[PDB]
Task: structure prediction
Amino acid sequence: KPRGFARGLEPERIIGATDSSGELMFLMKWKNSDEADLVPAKEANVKCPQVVISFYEERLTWHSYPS
Amino acid sequence: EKPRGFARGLEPERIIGATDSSGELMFLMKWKNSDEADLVPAKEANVKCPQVVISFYEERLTWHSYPS
Amino acid sequence: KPRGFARGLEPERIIGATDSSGELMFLMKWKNSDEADLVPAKEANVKCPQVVISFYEERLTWHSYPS
Amino acid sequence: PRGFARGLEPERIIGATDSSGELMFLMKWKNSDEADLVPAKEANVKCPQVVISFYEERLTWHSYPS
Amino acid sequence: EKPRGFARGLEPERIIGATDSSGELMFLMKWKNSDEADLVPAKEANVKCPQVVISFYEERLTWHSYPS
Amino acid sequence: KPRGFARGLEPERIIGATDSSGELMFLMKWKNSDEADLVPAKEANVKCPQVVISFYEERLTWHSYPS
Amino acid sequence: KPRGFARGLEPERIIGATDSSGELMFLMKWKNSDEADLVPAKEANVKCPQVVISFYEERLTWHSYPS
Amino acid sequence: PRGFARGLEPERIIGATDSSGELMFLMKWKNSDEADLVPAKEANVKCPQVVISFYEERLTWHSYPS
Amino acid sequence: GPLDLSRDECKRILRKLELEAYAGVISALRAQGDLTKEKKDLLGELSKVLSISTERHRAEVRRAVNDERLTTIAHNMSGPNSSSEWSIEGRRLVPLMPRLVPQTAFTVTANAVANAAI
Amino acid sequence: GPLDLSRDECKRILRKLELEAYAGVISALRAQGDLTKEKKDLLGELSKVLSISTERHRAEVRRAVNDERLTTIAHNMSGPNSSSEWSIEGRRLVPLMPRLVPQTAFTVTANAVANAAI
Result:
């Protein structure tokens, strides 16, 4: 079964992110499907830039700058 | 022994997570002027910082069938 | 004629929502009235925050996803 | 004039702030030592990859306690 | 029309010269906080800034026959 | 025994000077006394400034020199 | 007649200075002679350094720094 | 330690002041970015040409009016 | 000639001098040790006089905090605890979130409604 | 390695950073125009915090006043009268005297006396 963008669906909203795999991955909810799956940030950055920007923008908080 | 959650006397900045434990909704709260976020009961946050709670939900709203 | 919150009625509960208009709108059921109005979340958020929160708490969704 | 009005190519965002009430980015333009603030709403569409690069580089993790 | 010498209300810093004119000893006075030095009668300087006058003379003292 | 200004006499006039001792000294003639004392210029300058000035004013020297 | 240091006399005190000749010259009073004459600063700087230093030191005044 | 106590060769005097009550020179030493104040009485004998150079370069003329 | 500068060129040079001047003070202060109230007030007056914005200021602080050489000098001059206050002074907006894990993969999902009055 | 600096080397670097920092601010301020009370007070606080002596300060002012490029920038930014106050701030001790001329070739000459009591 195809997964990620291979499902040919439209990005709705990124639900979460993680780099535990060695690269940044986004958990993507696609329009009209409640089955979300992982997509590389490298791919999402290109295919759905505003969806990626929204994910980050709505999670901004002030934080001290580490040493 | 150290204060936790709202007892730290900090102003809420933004909720950055939510989970279930023992059977109660909890929010991982990022407080203003502190890098250390911690858990607070949703029941408490709903009353003390409603707009912060609403913002958390609103910016994550998705649809079963996308509207047109 | 007054519509939505302008009717001066007490909110009972949000029966539904939609953002197809460009902004999030809530279908509000008012106490003592079977005539529901679509009102801006912008307004509902400050007029009846607990009613809004209750709406979101009924739809909490945690995702399970393939590795 | 300032911001995108300068007619310069965005190079990279060096800072962000919501002190004005809206999200603003301190933009560093190509071939220029002078950086100015531009609305995030505007940078988002005019240079989406510059904005994404900015955020991705500063992504900060915070685990749940227990 | 502008004030000259002690009338300028400045404090003496150092006398940098002395000459004869019309038949009266005059001192070229360098004033504190001003680059412009001007003439003042020795008669006046002797009274108003004796140590400044003495310093001018003392540091220029020479001998007809050097003492041993 | 008290010498120089320590005699408490009123200065009459400086009759001469010399700095062979390492510092300028004035040979002071005191009023009502034919016994002159060599006193430090350091002292005479503040004790009797006008007497000192008078000494210098009698010896003003302007130089003429070859080109 | 020899002049300046050529007179074989000892420097006592510099009386004045001028660069009107194109170079800095000092009017030198020699010990035991009331006939002072001009000597190049370049020469005096080497032959009687303390006499030159004294001349300058006793003429120091605060002054603004030109543009 | 400071001044000639540093055991460095004097390079040039950059300033002078009598604020302390005695004439002091701000000395710049060879092979060192740190300058310190030294008594003029001391510099006069230890490096007379450095002192003379300092004064000669700053010699300022003032004519008599009339 | 070198001194034949246009009004615009003069403005550019001045702005560069102002930025370099501010950066230089930030570097020197960071090297001395952690930020203090005295130094914070001084920087406030300096940024005012040199027309340095708040966010340019914070970026310069981060630059200095991130400099290992200045950090090492500070450790030698005033010991550890030489960056806590600087770190707060150089605070920035960042996407802050827990790494994705099923138990935290959260979202609110709703069934969209119609329109107007119903 | 680059970060292996002795305590003494750290002190030398810090002192250099402090001097360059002060010099940089002097240059920037001179380029803006003439010295003002506001700027003088700022420099006083800066020299205190950066341990810059009064005479090192005056020497830096003279350096900036003597810089034709900074002077030219100042003239373009705030017009003439851009150095009167700086010139006073950078005041220095100088041998001040009239050029030698017979009428001014002056000295006090005396006949030396003996010693002790006479």
